[PDB]
């Protein structure tokens, strides 16, 4: 078995499409993090 | 080399804080240092604050 | 921070006597499994601290094969400890495969530290 | 001057060239790597090995031609270059050898000694050549799953398992009618365009070369060879590219020349370029650059490889790059625009119109075979003179701005930030 | 001055100068490789690098090399940027500058990597060792400056005040009309350089057949065989190097290489046998040197060879034109030997 | 076995032992230094510290020198501890231990740094390469291991199972008694050392002498030239060497060394002129060598030669019977010329 | 911070106007040989500030006799102010041994340094 064969990755692979998707959510996530730290803060 | 680590505050900060080769096995065990030393830190400021207005 | 000649001496004290050996080997092979590092799957040869001189001396003597397998035990080890799980019935290690090898290395070295300790200091020798 | 082109299931496309005085015919197939399962990868270039192993005597000897071939994704062709008196012999050398006979060429002790053979220099191979080592696991990092990743010459596993069968079959399924073009470079002008169209000249197989259904795909990945005995430290990057056929090419292709290469130690590359190059001059980080557009039917590969030696800096080296790739989706000046149009049609114009007719022959299949005609060299002028600073950045906003990365890497990488604060350098700072 | 060009209706045009001296007729061991490497900069009448980023900017690009016989300037560039890049070429040809000040952090480090990267390889430190036994203090010098002998700013601009002359210069081109160059080379500072004399030696080199040199290199175990070719026959050596290193002959898999230099009165050809060990290098190069002194026939490869010749012959500086008619057998004669590695194993030349 | 001694009222004791294998014998280039160089540490019984620091506290050191044909080891030690020093050198040589896990730190950056040491001096490699050359791989072996060629661990242990042997060695030193040294041998571990054959070469070696080499070295020059002598004329060479060396001779301010080996067999006769410069260097070996090739009357050297030969064989290991007494003319035939430094002005064997 | 070329250009317009010169140059030399770096034993180059990098481009360019003889200077300099005291007039520096010796190489680093920052930044406006 050489390197050159990735090892399974499909049981933790994105099955689904639109990966903006869970850009999305990674950047809405992130922007409510900020929010709540600034109310906070404030 | 980045002026991240060119400026003396700037580099220690890096060296100190961003920037530190620690294990990768840590469990919270090892964060629950840097939450008592936060708790010192908020006690002191809260101290300070308390003994402003203290007699 | 003990010896290791100390404890060679004790077991080449306890496992020549056939009653004492004959009653107290079983149960420490049953002991050392169910110590729980052999369910990990890392050889008994790699769980001793790395910071004192002696281990220093030992290992950097060790043969390029024995190194390279202790790499990957332990960044394996690393890696599963962090994952939460233990590693499938199939790439452990059995009794027959936690052979000693880092033994001599360590005998030699520390001789070689006692020696050096007990012979700076000499008397006179009246 | 213009290629002529026809086709009746085999494509005549010729370029004639009074210039050049070597003339050249091959046969190009739409099939390499990238239609084979990876079962046994190493089966095209055990077909280019088999085709360079004893023929080679019988063309010396009977007459003058010598043939070669390359096989990278999906240019695999087969070129036997000639004299120009002589192309009617080279075609019925390349007649005699891929239809009839076909059963001589494939002996047994020959398969085993090309067998050895191959596996000898693909051990060299992954031993010796780190810079293309480090491409290749990219490629295979890049498209996991999918029949894009694996190596062009296969690994040891894939060469050691399968013997004739295989072989075999893959010649059934992809050496047809459907997918061979006949290539005329060189000094000739009109006897290709009919000794190809001939009742003695067929190709066997007359059918259709079967369709995969998992096509491409592109997920960012890490690999990370890290072989610390050796001295200096090889890291490739990469971004979803794009791919032939597409009204983007020309502008990925100038985004790449913008940066342009760099060589430490030769002072000429040292005294040009782009504010990266003083960057990096101030202290030394780096000794190579290759800014590289790779290209396929399927998708495309936009990256950066590089070879350094001080191997503490890698995190600068790396920040750098990505800053300045950022400089470059937010803002352009004109004037590295217009030098980078002139140094493109520098290498365009060097790369298109070499001295060679074999590299020539190769273009000119690779166009034919997903296009149906060549583009000439006044027609990408015109085409890449359109392109404008707005272009430039609307093309770059939608490709380099937060899309996937995938790093290769080997050496010493020890200081070689994991994944995420090397991706991070791209949409976090004051905007 | 010799003036020539060539036309074509490919949009790229090439341009190059040729200076009829380099290592060959260096006074000093390594003076033509810091002259060539201190070559394009430093100019006196513009700058000295961004006077010329700003020539590239106009679409084209420089480049310098340095052989056993010519120092080489060469330019690419888009069919409209020939009168600029001809003007700018005659400029850096002008012995300009020669700064002590920008010669101790320049050249020096690039010299330095250079002969590091040659030495590395033990086929380049062979091959000059090759030429260094068969050719004396004449045309025999390293071609990389490596510090045994000193030289100094002023050797530097008396090696270009011998070669940078207007009688010995050859300049040539690609995809320009001949007129353009007809003129504008005279209309130019070229045509306004120091007149000298052509170094072009009008007889034949001497040579020195049967020496031997050995060195205990580190690495991989080397064996070169070269021998000394006239001009009277000239192409039954090329062929035979094409017949060696083809698929043809019965030894193609023990030969590293077997190429063959070109001169303007002969040349020398070489042959390599490398491996990492001494035992399979011993073995391939007796049998080879054995089968060799016997003799091979050598006519069914004069097609061959014609082709490999043609094919090569792009550059403008073609030599005679080497009829491969006279082609009928070969017998190995006296030569001269290398070895270079593990040399304690590689045999002898008496046993060889 | 041979035990000898010398009797001596002094009261400082020398004993030293004496193996016939060497560099010579040496199977691979370095296996003798390294062996060498391994040679005296970690006795299988007595330690590399803990029992050899005590000899020092005893008041004595131990020594282990190499050359051509002979590694001996020599112990030097105050008069009335002789037994204890015959036990502990006997122990040392009984291919005690030889760890694998030792060779790496101890031995190999001695190795490295004595052949650091033995390259910047050009007369050293001169020397090496006008052994190699002269003598091929048979006597004349690198003396040093550089790393040309790869030595194992398992091939040192072989190499010093094939010299430590019975027949192999001789054991002698001055300044003790005679009877008791050869009575604290029988009960000594040397009583019980295989009883192999002795190495020594029967015959004459094999010598080719008119070639030539060729050094590119940075640095000084120097120009080296060897003659292989028999055993029937050493003491010829010898009284030549002295002569040249001295005062008497005009050709004495330029000679940097005239010295010359022996061997039991045979030997070398060298010669040198170095320099800083190689504009010097040409000239004086151009008259060295074309007025030594004149000749020159020798016999008014002899009583000179007979008291440097005195005042250096002072040791117990005499040499053969050296009988100055049929000197009387010399005239130089044909050498082997070496070049080292500057390769380019230093001229050529066939006009030197 | 102050470019050195504009020092020349002021330099050459002074030299050749002939009533502004005559009147400026004694006072000149007079303020020079008044300013007291002269009994110093200092040579005017060794007084310019040496740390901004154009500045050590300069200086590696030097060769190293002059270099020799600055180290000297800044060293008998601070070991004579260290004492407060002056050495008579045997080490006092001349009238016209004040040449300078390091101004061509400013001025060409200057020049070359400028051009290549204006050039940089450049536009292809006609
Ligand atoms: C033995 C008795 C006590 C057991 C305590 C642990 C189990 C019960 C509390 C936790 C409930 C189960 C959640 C999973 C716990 C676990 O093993 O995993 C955690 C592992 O975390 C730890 O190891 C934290 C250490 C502390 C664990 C709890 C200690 C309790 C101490 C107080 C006990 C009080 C008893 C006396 C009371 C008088 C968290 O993992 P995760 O799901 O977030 O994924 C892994 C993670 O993201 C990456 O590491
Ligand atoms: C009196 C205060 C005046 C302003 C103070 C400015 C400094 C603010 C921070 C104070 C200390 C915070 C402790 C942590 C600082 C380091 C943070 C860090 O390292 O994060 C990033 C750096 O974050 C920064 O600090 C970057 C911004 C620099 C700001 C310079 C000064 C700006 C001053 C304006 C005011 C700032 C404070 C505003 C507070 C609301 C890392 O990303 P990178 O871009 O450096 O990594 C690139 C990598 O090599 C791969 O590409
Ligand atoms: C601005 C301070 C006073 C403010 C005076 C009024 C105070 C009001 C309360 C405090 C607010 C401070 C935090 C700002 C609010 C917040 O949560 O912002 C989150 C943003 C995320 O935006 P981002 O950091 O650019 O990342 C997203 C990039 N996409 C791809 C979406 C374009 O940003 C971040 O995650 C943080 C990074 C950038 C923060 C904004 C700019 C700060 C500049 C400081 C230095 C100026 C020089
Ligand atoms: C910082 C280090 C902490 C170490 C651990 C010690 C624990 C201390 C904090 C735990 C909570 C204690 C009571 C807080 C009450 C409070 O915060 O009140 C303020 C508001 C609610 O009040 P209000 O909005 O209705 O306005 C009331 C007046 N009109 O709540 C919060 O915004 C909690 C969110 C806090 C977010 C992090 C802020 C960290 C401190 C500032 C750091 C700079
Ligand atoms: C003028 C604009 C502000 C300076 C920006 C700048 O000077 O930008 C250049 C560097 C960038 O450092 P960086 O880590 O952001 O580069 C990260 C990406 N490569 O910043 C500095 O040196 C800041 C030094 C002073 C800090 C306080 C500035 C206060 C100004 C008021
Ligand atoms: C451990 C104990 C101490 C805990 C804290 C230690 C870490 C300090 C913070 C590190 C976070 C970081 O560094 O954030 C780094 C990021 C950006 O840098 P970047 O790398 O993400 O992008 C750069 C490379 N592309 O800027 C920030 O978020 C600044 C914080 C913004 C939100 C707060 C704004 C201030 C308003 C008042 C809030 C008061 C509270
Ligand atoms: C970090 C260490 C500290 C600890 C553990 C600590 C602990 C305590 C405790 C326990 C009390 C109340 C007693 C009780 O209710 O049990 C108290 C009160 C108080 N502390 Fe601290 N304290 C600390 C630091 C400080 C600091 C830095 C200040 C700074 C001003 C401060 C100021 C006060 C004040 C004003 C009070 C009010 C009652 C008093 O006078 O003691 N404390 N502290
Ligand atoms: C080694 O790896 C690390 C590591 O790098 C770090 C950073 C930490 C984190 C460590 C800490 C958080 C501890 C650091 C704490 C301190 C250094 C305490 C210092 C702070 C103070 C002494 C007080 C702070 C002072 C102020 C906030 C001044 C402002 C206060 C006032 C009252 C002025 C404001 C008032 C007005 C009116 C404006 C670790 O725990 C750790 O191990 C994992």
């Given at each position: 078995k050489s390197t050159y064969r990735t090892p399974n990755f499909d049981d933790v692979?994105?099955?689904?499409?639109?990966?903006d998707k869970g850009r999305s959510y990674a950047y809405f996530m992130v922007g409510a993090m900020g929010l709540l730290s600034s109310a906070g803060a404030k | 080399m980045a002026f991240r680590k060119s400026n003396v505050y700037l580099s220690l900060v890096n060296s100190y804080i961003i920037d530190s080769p620690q294990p990768?096995?840590?469990?919270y065990w090892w964060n629950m240092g840097s939450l008592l030393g936060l708790c010192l830190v908020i006690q002191i400021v809260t101290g300070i604050f308390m003994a402003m207005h203290y007699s | 921070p003990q010896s290791f000649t100390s404890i060679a001496r004790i077991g080449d004290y306890i496992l020549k006597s056939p009653v004492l050996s004959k009653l107290c080997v079983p149960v420490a092979n049953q002991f050392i499994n169910l110590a729980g590092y052999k369910k990990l799957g890392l050889?008994?040869?790699?769980?001793?601290?790395?910071?004192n001189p002696i281990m220093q001396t030992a290992l950097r003597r060790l043969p390029e094969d024995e190194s390279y397998a202790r790499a990957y035990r332990i960044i394996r080890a690393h890696q599963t400890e962090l994952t939460h799980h233990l590693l499938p019935r199939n790439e452990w290690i059995k009794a027959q495969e936690?052979?000693?090898?880092?033994?001599p290395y360590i005998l030699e070295a520390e001789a070689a530290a006692k020696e050096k300790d007990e012979l700076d200091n000499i008397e006179v020798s009246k | 001057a213009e290629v002529t082109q026809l086709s009746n299931g085999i494509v005549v496309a010729t370029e004639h060239?009074?210039?050049?005085?070597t003339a050249s015919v091959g046969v190009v197939f739409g099939?390499?790597?990238?239609?084979?399962?990876?079962?046994?990868?190493?089966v095209s270039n055990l077909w280019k090995n088999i085709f360079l192993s004893k023929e080679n005597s019988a063309v010396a000897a009977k007459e003058g031609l010598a043939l070669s071939s390359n096989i990278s994704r999906d240019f695999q062709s087969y070129i036997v270059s000639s004299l120009p008196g002589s192309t009617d012999k080279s075609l019925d050398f390349l007649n005699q050898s891929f239809?009839?006979?076909?059963?001589?060429?494939?002996?047994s002790s020959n398969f085993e000694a090309t067998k050895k053979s191959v596996l000898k220099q693909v051990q060299d191979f992954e031993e010796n050549d780190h810079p293309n080592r480090v491409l290749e696991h990219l490629h295979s990092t890049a498209?996991?799953?999918?029949?894009?990743?694996?190596?062009?010459?296969?690994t040891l596993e894939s060469l050691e398992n399968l013997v004739v069968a295989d072989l075999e079959s893959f010649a059934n399924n992809h050496?047809?009618?459907?997918n061979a073009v006949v290539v005329g470079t060189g000094?000739?002008?009109?006897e290709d365009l009919v000794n190809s169209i001939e009742s003695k000249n067929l190709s066997l197989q007359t059918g259709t070369k079967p369709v995969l259904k998992k096509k491409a795909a592109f997920l960012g990945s890490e690999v990370r060879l890290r072989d610390?005995?050796?001295?200096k430290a090889w890291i490739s990057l990469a971004v979803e590219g794009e791919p032939v056929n597409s009204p983007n090419y020309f502008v990925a292709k100038l985004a790449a020349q913008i940066f342009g290469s760099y060589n430490a130690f030769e002072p000429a590359s040292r005294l040009?370029?782009?504010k990266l190059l003083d960057n990096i001059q101030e202290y030394q980080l780096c000794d190579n650059f290759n800014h590289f557009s790779l290209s396929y039917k399927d998708s495309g590969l936009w990256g950066f490889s590089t070879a350094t030696r001080?191997?503490?800096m890698i995190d600068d080296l790396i920040h750098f790059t990505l800053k300045q790739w950022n400089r470059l989706t937010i803002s352009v000046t004109d004037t590295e625009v217009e030098r980078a149009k002139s140094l493109l049609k520098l290498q365009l114009g060097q790369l298109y119109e070499s001295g060679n007719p074999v590299n020539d022959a190769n273009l000119l299949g690779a166009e034919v075979l997903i296009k149906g005609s060549k583009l000439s060299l006044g027609e990408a002028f015109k085409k890449i003179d359109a392109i404008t600073v707005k272009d430039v950045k609307a093309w770059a906003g939608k490709r380099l701005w937060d899309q996937d990365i995938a790093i290769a890497g080997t050496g010493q990488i020890e200081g070689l930030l994991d994944y995420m604060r090397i991706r991070s350098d791209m949409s976090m700072m004051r905007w | 001055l010799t003036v020539s060009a060539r036309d074509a209706p490919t949009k790229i045009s090439t341009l190059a100068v040729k200076v009829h001296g380099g290592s060959r007729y260096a006074?000093?061991?390594?003076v033509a490789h810091l002259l060539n490497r201190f070559?394009?900069?430093?100019?006196?009448?513009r700058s000295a690098l961004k006077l010329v980023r700003e020539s590239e900017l106009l679409g084209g690009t420089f480049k310098s090399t340095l052989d056993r016989e010519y120092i080489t300037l060469k330019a690419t560039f888009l069919k409209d940027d020939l009168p600029y890049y001809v003007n700018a070429l005659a400029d850096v040809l002008y012995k300009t500058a020669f700064k002590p000040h920008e010669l101790t952090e320049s050249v020096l480090p690039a010299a330095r990597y250079d002969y590091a990267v040659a030495e590395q390889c033990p086929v380049k430190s062979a091959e000059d060792q090759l030429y260094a036994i068969t050719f004396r203090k004449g045309l025999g010098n390293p071609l990389l400056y490596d510090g045994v002998e000193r030289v100094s700013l002023q050797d530097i601009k008396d090696f270009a005040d011998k070669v940078y002359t207007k009688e010995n210069l050859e300049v040539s081109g690609e995809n320009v009309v001949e007129a353009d160059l007809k003129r504008f080379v005279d209309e130019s500072l070229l045509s306004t350089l120091p007149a000298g004399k052509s170094l072009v030696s009008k007889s034949e080199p001497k040579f020195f057949l049967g020496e031997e040199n050995r060195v205990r290199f580190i690495g991989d175990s080397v064996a070169a065989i070269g021998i000394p070719v006239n001009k009277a026959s000239l192409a039954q050596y090329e062929v035979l190097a094409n017949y060696l290193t083809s698929?043809?002959?019965?030894?193609?898999?023990?030969?590293?290489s077997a190429k063959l230099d070109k001169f303007t009165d002969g040349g020398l050809f070489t042959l390599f046998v490398r491996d990492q060990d001494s035992a399979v290098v011993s073995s391939n190069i007796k049998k080879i040197v054995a089968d060799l002194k016997k003799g091979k026939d050598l006519s069914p490869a004069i097609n061959y060879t014609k082709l490999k010749n043609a094919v090569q012959?792009?550059?403008?500086?073609?030599?005679?034109?080497?009829?491969?008619?006279?082609?009928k057998d070969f017998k190995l004669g006296k030569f001269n030997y290398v070895a270079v590695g593990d040399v304690s194993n590689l045999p002898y030349l008496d046993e060889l």
């Open positions: 692979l994105k099955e689904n499409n639109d990966a | 990768s096995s840590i469990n | 050889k008994f040869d790699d769980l001793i601290a790395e910071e936690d052979v000693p090898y880092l033994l | 060239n009074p210039s050049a005085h099939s390499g790597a990238a239609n084979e399962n990876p079962y046994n990868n190493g239809i009839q006979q076909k059963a001589n060429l494939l002996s498209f996991q799953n999918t029949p894009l990743s694996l190596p062009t010459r296969g050496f047809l009618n459907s000094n000739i002008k009109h610390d005995t050796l001295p040009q370029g782009i001080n191997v503490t | 006074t000093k061991d390594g070559n394009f900069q430093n100019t006196n009448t698929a043809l002959s019965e030894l193609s898999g023990l030969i590293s012959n792009e550059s403008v500086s073609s030599p005679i034109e080497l009829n491969f008619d006279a082609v």
